Design a protein around this ligand. Structure first.
Ligand code: HEM
Ligand code: HEM
Ligand SMILES: CCCCCC[C@H]1C(=O)O[C@H](C)[C@H](NC(=O)c2cccc(NC=O)c2O)C(=O)O[C@@H](C)[C@@H]1OC(=O)C(C)C
Lengths: 89, 378, 53, 89, 105, 48, 60
């Protein structure tokens, strides 16, 4: 959470980065999300939210893999797929 | 770090059937290696449960087996799975060696050779196996065969009586065979691992004989599940026998105890030695017959020295492909003759089949190979 | 001297795997039961009474 | 012709956002926007409905083997929710 | 050039089509058994040949697994079958034999 | 001679009936995993 | 209203815990019901049993 707060605040530094956030956000969120609001969103998050949210998107989900280069040892898609769940859990 | 790779034990297991790279290419003819493995353990496993009830001693031998079949809770399925698994162990052994020649696998000298050692040992084992119940076939089967060493010049006599423990088959011979039938499958099991060790040195051959390095897949998923399905099929077959046709492949007269006085004009070793049986007696010679019987199997170790073709698999070799099937059918012939009495048609035809066998493997296939080279401009 | 594992995080790690460790004992009990045809426990299950009238 | 038609198709006011950050006053910006931008959607289109159809995701894999490259790049992903989902945080 | 030379050629074209590798897109040389000499010649191929050989064999191993073959119009037409490995194989054999010959004196 | 005779065949029925569910299933399982390989697409893209 | 298979996945197949729990719970009931129906099928096609033979000897 702290990393993300740092990132956010740090990223919004100077005319350009800000201007770009305005214009782009208007496109995407319809409005401009005031720093404070992001800070509130981040604060809400804690371990449980992470586990629940991570599981929702990553747990036992099908990956899209892209490879390039000396990839002979890149694991087979089945194998990568199997790595998206744990037999302990 | 992944413990599945650095732990002294798992390494072996990772290398055996998890990370080992295999041809994306192999087909059903490659399953008989797992099947032989399965066979070996299941054989060891039922075999052991029979030993907790079996005996030895010529007096009780037959009695104990029936005891098992009738009295021992479930002793029957165990007994019959053992006896039927034994046949299956030959069907696979046979198929394995088959797959091998066709596809040129024998080019892995050490591996092939260990496999020949694996063949003689399970043969030697299964032989001793059927002497155990002490039936009619068991007694003269144990007699007709063993004797053969009496054809060996100068010392034949000595050895056959040394392996006997007397002057004929009795007391000393049943206990002996039981013990040997017990220790062999363990020794085989070791040899198997060395067989498999040398195999991992090159990885597996494939239907094209080309070289799959350019397209390997992980044993993980792929060949583990294609081995499971496969094993299920082997179970279907083994169970079909045991549960529907228990004595279909079994000589009905190994029932009725022994009797050094009798000998029932018929008598042949278990089906899987018929082709060999046919060869031996298709020769009017004590020395020649047994000499020819030996060559009949020890010729496998000769095959690689007569590879003549510039291609490895027979996948693209019609000429040899024909001589291969002629070999199989001809072996099916020898099996059939072996199963018949030494009389009119049966003699001369089994005599022709023998010559064919040796002439085919020793002259025909090697020539078919060279002609194919010449046809391709190689 | 298992004191290395005494702290807030360990307490959270422990708690996270409570449902798993629980359900994993449910698997083993039922598993032991079903495998040995536990006369005692099974009699209670509605169906599965292959030893009644 | 391919270009101008994409231009007119897509460069329409309700899809543009004049953005700015720094030493300005919002009124001055509005004035300008109204002075130099007035007359872009003096024509709200008949039946040109620039609507984005959702995009299917596919658990799939692309491997461009090339043992001539010194190092391999791999990129693995799972389907994300999208700009507006609160799960992002 | 003979009427019968076309016959030998005809027996050869016949075997070729029978041998069948062409249905898998292979070339005669793509199917040689790999031995030391053959391995060394594989080593001596220029990039493009080597790369093409790899792609071929991959395409076959792939087919072989699906147990399919190529559409007929894409099979390797005998006579369009390039003997790309023979010259190297032949040269590798020559030098081995020179060695073998030197070892006798 | 064969007391086990009837049980033998009773089991034999189950053996057929069991394999009748298993063979197809353990086969559909192997398909799943090999399907990645079976529909895989190759492209060869050499330089120039 | 989703799907049977969907709802089935969420509540029991997702976690390897419940997944395994489901099969041990599902094997117990299967062994019972398959042994009933099976033997029944085995009897229905027979009837020279020792079952229908008993009715005759409840005495001694
Ligand atoms: C104790 C009996 C045997 C066991 C347990 C055994 C086990 C195996 C296994 C697991 C494989 C790899 C899987 C496969 O290719 O099917 C294999 C391959 C092979 N075995 Fe055996 N085998 C036995 C008897 C033989 C025999 C009779 C021969 C030939 C005399 C033999 C020579 C080979 C060869 C050459 C291969 C390589 C096959 C290939 O690469 O395509 N082994 N064996
Ligand atoms: C070391 C594990 C093994 C043990 C403990 C074992 C022990 C026995 C015993 C006590 C018998 C006599 C009971 C009977 O005939 O049913 C027997 C029969 C036999 N077993 Fe084994 N054996 C073992 C491995 C093998 C192997 C590797 C084979 C070869 C496939 C084999 C094939 C036979 C045969 C052919 C018979 C006699 C055939 C028959 O039952 O009619 N067994 N074994
Ligand atoms: C105890 C079980 C764990 C397995 C470890 C031992 C067993 C072992 O080593 O496992 C792997 C699975 C080994 N190879 C294969 O099966 C195998 C190899 C290529 C292809 C296929 N199939 C289809 O293309 C295969 O199936 C194989 O099948 O060898 C057996 C004979 C050996 O078995 C033995 O040693 C005996 C001596 C135990």
């Amino acid at each position: 959470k702290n990393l993300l707060r740092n990132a956010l605040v740090s990223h919004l530094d100077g005319t350009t980065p800000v201007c770009e956030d305005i214009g782009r956000s208007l496109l995407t969120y319809g409005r401009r999300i005031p720093l404070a609001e992001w800070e509130s969103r981040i604060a809400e998050v804690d371990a449980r939210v992470v586990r629940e949210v991570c599981s929702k998107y990553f747990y036992d989900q099908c990956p899209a893999v892209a490879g390039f280069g000396p990839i002979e040892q890149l694991p087979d898609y089945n194998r990568i797929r199997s790595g998206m769940f744990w037999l302990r859990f | 770090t992944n413990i599945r790779k650095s732990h002294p034990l798992m390494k072996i297991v990772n290398n055996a059937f998890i990370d080992l790279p295999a041809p994306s290419n192999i087909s059903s003819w490659w399953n008989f290696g797992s099947l032989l493995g399965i066979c070996l353990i299941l054989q060891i496993l039922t075999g052991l449960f029979l030993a907790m009830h079996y005996t030895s001693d010529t007096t009780t031998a037959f009695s104990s087996v029936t005891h098992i079949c009738r009295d021992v809770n479930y002793g029957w399925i165990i007994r019959y799975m053992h006896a039927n698994g034994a046949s299956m162990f030959f069907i696979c052994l046979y198929m394995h060696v088959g797959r091998g020649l066709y596809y040129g696998s024998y080019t892995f000298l050490e591996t092939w050779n260990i496999g020949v050692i694996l063949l003689l040992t399970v043969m030697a084992t299964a032989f001793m196996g059927y002497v155990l119940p002490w039936g009619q076939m068991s007694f003269w089967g144990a007699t007709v065969i063993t004797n053969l060493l009496s054809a060996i010049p100068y010392i034949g006599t000595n050895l056959v009586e040394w392996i006997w423990g007397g002057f004929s088959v009795d007391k000393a011979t049943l206990t002996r065979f039981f013990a040997f039938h017990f220790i062999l499958p363990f020794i085989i099991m070791a040899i198997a691992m060395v067989h498999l060790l040398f195999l991992h040195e090159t990885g597996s051959n494939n239907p094209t004989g080309i070289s799959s390095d350019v397209d390997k897949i992980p044993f993980h998923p792929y060949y583990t599940i294609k081995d499971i399905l496969g094993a299920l099929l082997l179970i279907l077959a083994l169970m079909l026998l045991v549960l529907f046709a228990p004595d279909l492949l079994g000589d009905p007269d190994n029932y009725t105890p022994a009797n050094p006085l009798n000998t029932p004009p018929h008598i042949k070793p278990e089906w899987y030695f018929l082709f060999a049986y046919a060869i031996l007696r298709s020769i009017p010679n004590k020395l020649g017959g047994v000499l020819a019987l030996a060559f009949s199997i020890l010729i496998l170790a000769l095959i690689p020295l007569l590879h003549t073709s510039k291609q490895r698999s027979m996948m693209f070799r019609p000429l040899s492909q024909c001589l291969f099937w002629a070999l199989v059918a001809d072996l099916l012939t020898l099996t059939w003759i072996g199963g018949q009495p030494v009389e009119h048609p049966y003699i001369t035809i089994g005599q022709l089949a023998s010559v064919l066998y040796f002439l085919l493997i020793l002259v025909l296939m090697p020539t078919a190979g060279t002609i194919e080279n010449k046809l391709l401009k190689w | 001297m298992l004191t290395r594992f005494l702290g807030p995080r360990y307490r959270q790690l422990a708690r996270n795997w409570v449902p798993t460790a629980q359900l994993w004992g449910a698997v083993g009990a039922v598993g032991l039961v079903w495998a040995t045809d536990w006369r005692l426990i099974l009699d209670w299950v509605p169906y599965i009474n292959g030893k009644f009238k | 012709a391919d270009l101008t038609e994409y231009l007119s198709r897509h460069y329409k006011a309700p899809r543009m956002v004049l953005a700015a950050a720094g030493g300005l006053e919002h009124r001055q910006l509005l004035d300008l926007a109204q002075k130099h931008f007035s007359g872009l959607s003096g024509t709200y289109d008949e039946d040109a409905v620039p609507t984005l159809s959702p995009c299917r995701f596919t658990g799939s894999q692309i491997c461009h083997r090339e043992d001539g490259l010194p190092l391999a790049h791999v990129a693995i992903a799972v389907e994300g929710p999208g700009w507006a989902h609160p799960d992002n945080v | 050039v003979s009427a019968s030379s076309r016959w030998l050629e005809g027996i050869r074209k016949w075997y070729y089509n029978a041998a069948g590798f062409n249905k898998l897109g292979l070339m005669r040389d793509d199917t040689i058994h790999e031995n030391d000499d053959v391995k060394e010649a594989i080593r001596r191929l220029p990039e493009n040949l080597y790369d093409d050989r790899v792609f071929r064999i991959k395409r076959a191993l792939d087919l072989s697994m699906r147990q399919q073959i190529l559409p007929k119009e894409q099979w390797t037409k005998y006579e369009e079958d390039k003997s790309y490995l023979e010259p190297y194989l032949k040269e590798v054999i020559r030098e081995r034999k020179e060695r073998e010959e030197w070892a006798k004196k | 001679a064969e007391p086990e005779h009837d049980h033998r065949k009773r089991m034999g029925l189950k053996m057929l009936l069991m394999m009748g569910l298993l063979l197809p299933l353990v086969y559909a399982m192997k398909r799943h995993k090999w399907s990645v390989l079976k529909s895989r697409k190759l492209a060869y893209r050499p330089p120039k | 209203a989703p799907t049977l298979t969907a709802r089935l996945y969420s509540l029991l197949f997702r976690r390897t815990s419940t997944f395994a729990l489901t099969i041990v719970v599902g094997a117990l009931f299967f062994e019972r019901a398959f042994d009933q129906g099976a033997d029944a099928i085995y009897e229905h096609i027979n009837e020279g049993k020792l079952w229908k033979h008993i009715k005759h000897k409840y005495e001694n």
